[PDB]
Swiss-Prot record, chain A:
The gene is MED6. The lineage of its organism: Eukaryota, Metazoa, Chordata, Craniata, Vertebrata. Component of the Mediator complex, which is composed of MED1, MED4, MED6, MED7, MED8, MED9, MED10, MED11, MED12, MED13, MED13L, MED14, MED15, MED16, MED17, MED18, MED19, MED20, MED21, MED22, MED23, MED24, MED25, MED26, MED27, MED29, MED30, MED31, CCNC, CDK8 and CDC2L6/CDK11. The MED12, MED13, CCNC and CDK8 subunits form a distinct module termed the CDK8 module. Mediator containing the CDK8 module is less active than Mediator lacking this module in supporting transcriptional activation. Belongs to the Mediator complex subunit 6 family. It comes from the Eukaryota. Component of the Mediator complex, a coactivator involved in the regulated transcription of nearly all RNA polymerase II-dependent genes. Mediator functions as a bridge to convey information from gene-specific regulatory proteins to the basal RNA polymerase II transcription machinery. Mediator is recruited to promoters by direct interactions with regulatory proteins and serves as a scaffold for the assembly of a functional preinitiation complex with RNA polymerase II and the general transcription factors. It is found in: Nucleus. It comes from Homo sapiens. This is Mediator of RNA polymerase II transcription subunit 6.
Curated annotation (Swiss-Prot), chain B:
It comes from Homo sapiens (Human). Belongs to the Mediator complex subunit 14 family. Ubiquitous. Coiled coil: none annotated. Interacts with GATA1. Component of the Mediator complex, which is composed of MED1, MED4, MED6, MED7, MED8, MED9, MED10, MED11, MED12, MED13, MED13L, MED14, MED15, MED16, MED17, MED18, MED19, MED20, MED21, MED22, MED23, MED24, MED25, MED26, MED27, MED29, MED30, MED31, CCNC, CDK8 and CDC2L6/CDK11. The MED12, MED13, CCNC and CDK8 subunits form a distinct module termed the CDK8 module. Mediator containing the CDK8 module is less active than Mediator lacking this module in supporting transcriptional activation. This is Mediator of RNA polymerase II transcription subunit 14. It is found in: Nucleus.
Length: 25, 49
């Protein structure tokens, strides 16, 4: 009846982005 | 919206270049070009001759 092992950098940029741009809700 | 995107945008490009320089320093060019400062997300500087 996959990851090309570059998230060890792009992740940092996102953190730098989040740390600099908090959500407004 | 434009300010936030432009920044992130202008930061991923900078990283692309630093990676390339380091990779080149190994294979072909080698100990003839040097990095002197890389604070991430803002700027880098290279030395030659």
């Amino acid at each position: 009846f996959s990851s090309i092992f570059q998230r060890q950098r792009v992740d940092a940029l996102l953190l730098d982005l989040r740390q600099k741009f908090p959500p407004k809700f | 919206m434009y300010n936030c995107l432009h920044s992130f945008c202008l930061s991923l490009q900078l990283e692309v270049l630093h990676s390339q320089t380091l990779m080149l320093i190994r294979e072909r060019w080698g100990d003839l070009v040097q990095v002197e400062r890389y604070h991430a997300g803002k700027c880098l500087s290279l030395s030659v001759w």
